[PDB]
Amino acid sequence: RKTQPYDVYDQVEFDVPIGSRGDCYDRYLCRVEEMRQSIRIISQCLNKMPPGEI
Amino acid sequence: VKQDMPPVGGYGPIDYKRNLPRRGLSGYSMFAVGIGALLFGYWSMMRWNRERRRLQIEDFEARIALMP
């Protein structure tokens, strides 16, 4: 999403979490933070809905 | 007119904080109140056991005087 934005993802504010260690507690933490960043993207997408076209 | 589904003038924000209260006692306070109730139980235990030994000695004296 941040190296080749294939759509309008370049206009929303978020950050992907980076993992520190080779383990799955940390990977669990990055999953949960990706969920919360998805919530942020949903809030900004509700605030930026154009009435264009189907 | 047109009748799509727009947002009405902008909507409210929604939080993204890991909202944690971390409440409860500290180490020292919880530790001290546990040890304090422990020592309270010890003092009452000591009192009841020594009065109980008094009564059990009375029971011994009953069997002594009863025997011959």
Q: Distance, in angstroms, between A2 CA and closest chain B CA? A: 20
Solved with: cryo-EM
Among the listed residues A47, A35, A38, A50, the one whose alpha carbon sits nearest the alpha carbon of residue B9? A47
What would the two tokens of residue B2 be?
Answer: 């047109």
Measured from the Cβ of residue A19, the count of other Cβ atoms closer than 10 Å reads: 11
What would the two tokens of residue A22 be?
Answer: 């080779």
The full DSSP string for B2-22 is: ------SS-------------
Among the listed residues A30, A38, A36, the one whose alpha carbon sits nearest the alpha carbon of residue A12? A38
Resolution in Å equals 4.1
Q: Which residues contact B15 (CB under 8 A, 6 or more apart)?
A: none
Q: Quick check: B13 contacting A, CB < 8 Å?
A: yes
Interface size, chain A vs chain B, as Cβ–Cβ contacts under 8 Å:
21
Q: Which residue of A has its CA nearest to B10?
A: A47
Determine, for residues B16 and A36 on separate chains, whether the beta-carbon distance falls below 8 Å.
Answer: yes
State the residue for tokens 């924000």. Answer: B13
The b-or-e profile of B28-51 (16+ CB within 10 A means b, else e) is eeeeeeeeeeeeeeeeeeeeeeee
The full DSSP string for A25-53 is: HHHHHHHHHHHHHHHHHHHHHHHT-----
